[PDB]
Design a protein around this ligand. Sequence first.
Ligand SMILES: CC(=O)N[C@@H](CSC/C=C(\C)CC/C=C(\C)CC/C=C(\C)CCC=C(C)C)C(=O)O
Ligand SMILES: CC(=O)N[C@@H](CSC/C=C(\C)CC/C=C(\C)CC/C=C(\C)CCC=C(C)C)C(=O)O
Lengths: 181, 181
Amino acid sequence: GAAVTEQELLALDTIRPEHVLRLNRVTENYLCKPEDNVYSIDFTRFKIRDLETGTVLFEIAKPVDISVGRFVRYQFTPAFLRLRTVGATVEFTVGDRPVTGFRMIERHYFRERLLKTFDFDFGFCIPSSRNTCEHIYEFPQLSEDVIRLMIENPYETRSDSFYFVDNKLVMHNKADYAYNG
Amino acid sequence: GAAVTEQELLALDTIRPEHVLRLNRVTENYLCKPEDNVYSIDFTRFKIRDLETGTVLFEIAKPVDISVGRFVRYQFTPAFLRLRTVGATVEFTVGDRPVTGFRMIERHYFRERLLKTFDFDFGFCIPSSRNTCEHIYEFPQLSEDVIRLMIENPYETRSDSFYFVDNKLVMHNKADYAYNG
Ligand SMILES: CC(=O)N[C@@H](CSC/C=C(\C)CC/C=C(\C)CC/C=C(\C)CCC=C(C)C)C(=O)O
Ligand SMILES: CC(=O)N[C@@H](CSC/C=C(\C)CC/C=C(\C)CC/C=C(\C)CCC=C(C)C)C(=O)O
């Protein structure tokens, strides 16, 4: 199907996975509100491994309770862009409502250029508890020119992560990235 | 001056402190982009004290470099709403550009009701280093009805924090709050 705009999706009754898969630019604004996370999904830890070498690259964890939402800025080193197969172990809590079809679509762009879409299922989740999921990211094979542009233009690589439960958008996190660490 | 809308501010060449002081609702969307933080301000730690008792209430710190931006969700206990004078010690780094007039305007709302505006100056900042500032929040004297509504309706209390450097908006962080911890 043809490309859709951020403004078109905001006018819909419900945003479905198939709809965000036709966005052709990273969004400017968010496509849902914090209060749409009616399942209280809260990411608490992720551990990132290079699956070719088995090396743990890094682990990020949450340090009155706070939930960081909506936006993360990452600065990586240039070798990050040379990875091929990266495993993410993602820990998260969920609230008291049962979750079905928890699905994540991530779209990564350098400026206006889509680099890669990832579309993962989270699997079965126990309510009111910590849950864990492993995702395997097969990185795009980036050209040398694109790699150079991404290193030279920090934070112009950006992503949208759209999280669905039962085919309805419930969370939308954004990020930008540099590779000049 | 009369109230301004989020859409009116987005149409301006530059958003000034006086402009956000006339918003009469928490914003739906952000009034600047991540890339507008051309000073690379990154909050790294804050320590919150009840200044009446001297008690440290809590400290939040950041755990490849990441910067959490744009949105934090807080869950406090109901006693938080009874505080009167709260000291925040805020640690942050700044990039290589010199900073002048670093100013923060925070507006806190329960639903559509403005509870309090805070307007603080950060003082002088050394580029390319960690900086610290102390702010003193004089909490509004909330009615018992408002306190009850805020406890009973988690995450319907929301804030905008608008950060200015040299009278131009450079960061806009948002939060929502519960008081039923
Ligand atoms: C509030 C917020 O935003 N929470 C974030 C982080 S918590 C959930 C963590 C997840 C889903 C793991 C994210 C995976 C990684 C960081 C590994 C690095 C791989 C990439 C950045 C893709 C690389 C793509 C290209 C090179 C084109 C989020 O929702 O993700
Ligand atoms: C990305 C992001 O969002 N970073 C956040 C947190 S880093 C800077 C920390 C600051 C400015 C300290 C914030 C102060 C507190 C948390 C103390 C609690 C006081 C209140 C919540 C006001 C209470 C108001 C009423 C009861 C009406 C931000 O920019 O703030």
